[PDB]
Design an enzyme around this catalytic site. Structure first.
Site, PDB file in Angstrom:
ATOM      1  CE1 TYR A 134     -21.237  80.142 -51.353  1.00 14.36           C
ATOM      2  CE2 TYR A 134     -23.235  79.713 -52.619  1.00 14.36           C
ATOM      3  CZ  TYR A 134     -22.555  79.727 -51.416  1.00 14.36           C
ATOM      4  OH  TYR A 134     -23.210  79.294 -50.285  1.00 14.36           O
TER       5      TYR A 134
ATOM      6  CG  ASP B 169     -24.669  79.407 -47.251  1.00 10.72           C
ATOM      7  OD1 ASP B 169     -25.912  79.269 -47.242  1.00 10.72           O
ATOM      8  OD2 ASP B 169     -23.869  78.448 -47.089  1.00 10.72           O
TER       9      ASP B 169
ATOM     10  CG  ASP C  13     -28.879  79.125 -43.905  1.00  2.00           C
ATOM     11  OD1 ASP C  13     -29.953  79.695 -44.207  1.00  2.00           O
ATOM     12  OD2 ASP C  13     -28.363  78.243 -44.627  1.00  2.00           O
TER      13      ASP C  13
ATOM     14  CE  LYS D  23     -10.333  84.527 -39.490  1.00  2.93           C
ATOM     15  NZ  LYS D  23     -10.711  84.265 -38.064  1.00  2.93           N
TER      16      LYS D  23
ATOM     17  CG  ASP E 130     -13.571  84.316 -35.943  1.00  2.00           C
ATOM     18  OD1 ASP E 130     -13.690  85.522 -36.236  1.00  2.00           O
ATOM     19  OD2 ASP E 130     -12.500  83.832 -35.503  1.00  2.00           O
TER      20      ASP E 130
HETATM   21  C1  LIG Z   1      -6.250  84.073 -37.254  1.00  3.81           C
HETATM   22  C2  LIG Z   1      -6.759  83.948 -35.854  1.00  3.81           C
HETATM   23  C3  LIG Z   1      -7.539  85.165 -35.488  1.00  3.81           C
HETATM   24  C4  LIG Z   1      -7.444  82.635 -35.538  1.00  3.81           C
HETATM   25  C5  LIG Z   1      -8.047  81.897 -36.698  1.00  3.81           C
HETATM   26  O1  LIG Z   1      -8.896  82.419 -37.497  1.00  3.81           O
HETATM   27  O2  LIG Z   1      -7.695  80.693 -36.844  1.00  3.81           O
HETATM   28  C6  LIG Z   1      -8.493  82.698 -34.464  1.00  3.81           C
HETATM   29  O3  LIG Z   1      -9.713  83.061 -35.001  1.00  3.81           O
HETATM   30  C7  LIG Z   1      -8.630  81.315 -33.939  1.00  3.81           C
HETATM   31  O4  LIG Z   1      -9.729  80.703 -34.040  1.00  3.81           O
HETATM   32  O5  LIG Z   1      -7.640  80.754 -33.419  1.00  3.81           O
HETATM   33  C1  LIG Z   2     -28.464  75.316 -51.798  1.00  4.71           C
HETATM   34  C2  LIG Z   2     -27.273  76.222 -51.713  1.00  4.71           C
HETATM   35  C3  LIG Z   2     -26.631  76.234 -53.067  1.00  4.71           C
HETATM   36  C4  LIG Z   2     -27.706  77.614 -51.332  1.00  4.71           C
HETATM   37  C5  LIG Z   2     -26.528  78.519 -51.158  1.00  4.71           C
HETATM   38  O1  LIG Z   2     -25.453  78.095 -50.648  1.00  4.71           O
HETATM   39  O2  LIG Z   2     -26.609  79.724 -51.515  1.00  4.71           O
HETATM   40  C6  LIG Z   2     -28.488  77.635 -50.054  1.00  4.71           C
HETATM   41  O3  LIG Z   2     -27.706  77.176 -49.010  1.00  4.71           O
HETATM   42  C7  LIG Z   2     -28.903  79.042 -49.776  1.00  4.71           C
HETATM   43  O4  LIG Z   2     -28.459  79.646 -48.766  1.00  4.71           O
HETATM   44  O5  LIG Z   2     -29.693  79.630 -50.558  1.00  4.71           O
HETATM   45 MG   LIG Z   3     -11.724  82.321 -34.447  1.00  2.63          MG
HETATM   46 MG   LIG Z   4     -27.831  78.265 -46.981  1.00  2.00          MG
END
Ligand SMILES: CC(C)[C@H](C(=O)O)[C@@H](O)C(=O)O
Ligand SMILES: CC(C)[C@H](C(=O)O)[C@@H](O)C(=O)O
Ligand SMILES: [Mg+2]
Ligand SMILES: [Mg+2]
Lengths: 369, 365
Positions: A151, A258, A262, A202, A234
């Site tokens: 950011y 963020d 959310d 990550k 993920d």
């Molecule tokens: C790096 C590896 C763990 C991979 C990625 O982040 O792309 C996995 O999460 C996927 O989605 O294939």
């Molecule tokens: C509006 C955007 C800049 C903001 C952020 O990404 O932090 C919002 O998504 C939040 O989560 O407060």
């Molecule tokens: Mg993944």
């Molecule tokens: Mg947000």
């Protein structure tokens, strides 16, 4: 013998109000009133000062965050913000968009620690798209690093290469000290809840996340009552859908914060109920609802004021150490919901549909009883 | 006849954990389906991931890259395990996966997320919300913060560590993934949602700018834009609203996994990674599941369906791909479930038995 301070045992705090755009002014006006009343019952007085930010600041002085607003905020004990954004400014240059002012005030106040509680309230369980058995009882806290990472990282920009082609770039960057400080907040936070902290990164791809995980890990020994675990962003996104009850406290960086906060917000089912706190070391904190400026219902007495009211409770608790006054507000919100009161966004069959002001009146009624 | 048989060379990358079990089954299903269409395969198995680390000390051997590039398609099992998580960054299993994606230049990652009617109860979302979900994530796979420079952990003058990565896209990288996604939406329901963080990040401003400019090349496709945080919420609130989504490397990783778990059955989901020229890379999205490795518990259906994407997208073998899809459907409609998709009233089976059920459906036809 009357108490600490120089006003008859009362505490007086200076609060900067940043109503902002859309429904922001309506909901801040209500929270201000609830804040005054609950505070008064604990010997707390307030000096309020309204200043412009976002589109309101743009229409006024042509910047989303005036120097004078920053000065006022910095000289205050706490800051309560409404909401930011509107269609009017959507075709502006990016430094002249309302969101810019929000990022700038976070940086200016150095409020690196963003707290966002996601809880499913029993009165509103059915609002979640998750099955009842999975949603009921969800109660997690996302601690998000708010003033660093991609950011605010340099270098950044869009440039044209020697082939005449545009290249856009941003930098995810963290110094060790930035990780340590957000980690410490999260450990202290988990310690006061169920003693479980999940650090989210990550680290199987990104060197920035490897450092994150290294620093968080090295801190665990200073919090032996906190069970630390690590999860890839993920997988965290999947676990929030699969078993959100597993989480107590989550700590993560700016962008992952963020996205995940959310996601967790929508899983609870009621966005209009959710407050947030942004804390600095020793300076005034920034408190605001997680919802947007909802321009399509602005001025119509429709908005849910409860998230802003609860942000004012967070302001009392986290910002001012005024826990009893915070509890009076939290209690009053609960009584309103138990009495069947609902603004449009949380309305269900058989409840009492009320407008913004009217919901505030009910919370106020309960504080004063 | 032997002279007129269609023949393809497939590189197998079983990898780690349950990878070898599931790829062995998909290999057999692939042979059987293909042979009914007069298609024969030459399979070669190569090391990658922890398996390559254990053999030659790197997660992606030169010989593996050579084999993969020389083949018509690559089918991969799974990567990763606890055994190697305490490894130096250059030597963790996952680095091998990123490296093979880069080497094959498979920038276009297709991850279809559907809720099957037989398995609707497996989602944690209410039935009325989960039923009918059918989306496709098109994820930029070889660029962005995953591969951006500069990157590293450095110690500054003060002795303080700073860790950093670069999210960077040249316009042509965005154009190419976007075109794939527009073409994808056109073949689906004609809706594309481009997902970015253009309210904060310059890289995403360029993203949105390029996708917007391309809209007019596909005027039959309805394009909208959504912030990644909003998308993470919309996937929870109303995932039925999406047809096709296009997004960058890191947002695609997060959102596709969120979409996968929303469908409720990770063991069912295949993926394709496609390049402009050369073999594509086909793999399930589930992980290596090392706790059930060698226990005959794995769900092979995701890898089996990845082999169907291999035929369909990689080789243009449409009829063979349908035979496989039809057979998975037959096996589910017969009540077969592995543990991850089990419900009361179904036949709980192991990995091998599920494969054999799919196989006999194929050979039935
Ligand atoms: C790096 C590896 C763990 C991979 C990625 O982040 O792309 C996995 O999460 C996927 O989605 O294939
Ligand atoms: C509006 C955007 C800049 C903001 C952020 O990404 O932090 C919002 O998504 C939040 O989560 O407060
Ligand atoms: Mg993944
Ligand atoms: Mg947000």
């Amino acid at each position: 013998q009357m108490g600490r301070g120089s006003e008859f045992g009362k505490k007086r705090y200076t609060i900067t109000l940043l109503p902002g755009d859309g429904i922001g002014p309506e909901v801040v006006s209500i929270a201000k009133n609830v804040l005054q009343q609950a505070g008064s019952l604990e010997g707390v007085e307030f000096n309020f000062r309204e200043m412009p930010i976002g589109g309101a600041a743009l229409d006024l002085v042509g910047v989303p965050l005036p120097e004078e607003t920053i000065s006022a905020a910095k000289e205050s004990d706490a800051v309560l913000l409404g909401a930011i954004g509107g269609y009017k400014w959507d075709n502006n240059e990016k430094h002249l968009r309302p969101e810019k002012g929000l990022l700038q005030i976070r940086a200016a106040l150095k409020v690196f620690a963003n707290l966002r509680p996601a809880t499913v309230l029993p009165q509103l369980v059915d609002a979640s798209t998750l099955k009842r058995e999975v949603a009921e009882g969800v109660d997690l806290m996302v601690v998000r690093e708010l003033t660093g990472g991609i950011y605010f990282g340099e270098p950044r920009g869009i440039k044209t290469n020697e082939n005449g082609e545009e290249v856009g770039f941003n930098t995810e960057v963290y110094a060790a000290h930035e990780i340590d400080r957000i980690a410490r907040v999260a450990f202290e936070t988990a310690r006061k809840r169920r003693g479980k902290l999940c650090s989210v990164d990550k680290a199987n791809v990104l060197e920035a996340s490897i450092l994150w995980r290294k620093r968080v890990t090295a801190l665990a020994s200073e919090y032996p009552d906190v069970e630390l675990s690590h999860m890839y962003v993920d997988n965290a996104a999947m676990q929030l859908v699969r078993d959100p009850k597993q989480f107590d406290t989550i700590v993560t960086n700016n962008i992952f914060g963020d996205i995940l906060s959310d996601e967790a917000s929508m899983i609870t089912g009621s966005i209009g109920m959710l407050p947030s706190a942004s804390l600095s070391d020793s300076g005034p904190g920034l408190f605001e609802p997680i919802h947007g400026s909802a321009p399509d219902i602005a001025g119509q007495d429709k908005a849910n004021p409860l998230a802003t009211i609860l942000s004012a409770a967070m302001l009392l608790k986290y910002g001012l150490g005024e826990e009893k006054a915070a509890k009076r507000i939290e209690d009053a919100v609960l009584v309103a919901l138990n009495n069947g009161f609902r603004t449009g966004d949380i309305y269900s069959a058989g409840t009492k549909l009320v407008g913004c002001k009217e919901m505030g009146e009910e919370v106020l009624k309960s504080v004063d009883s």
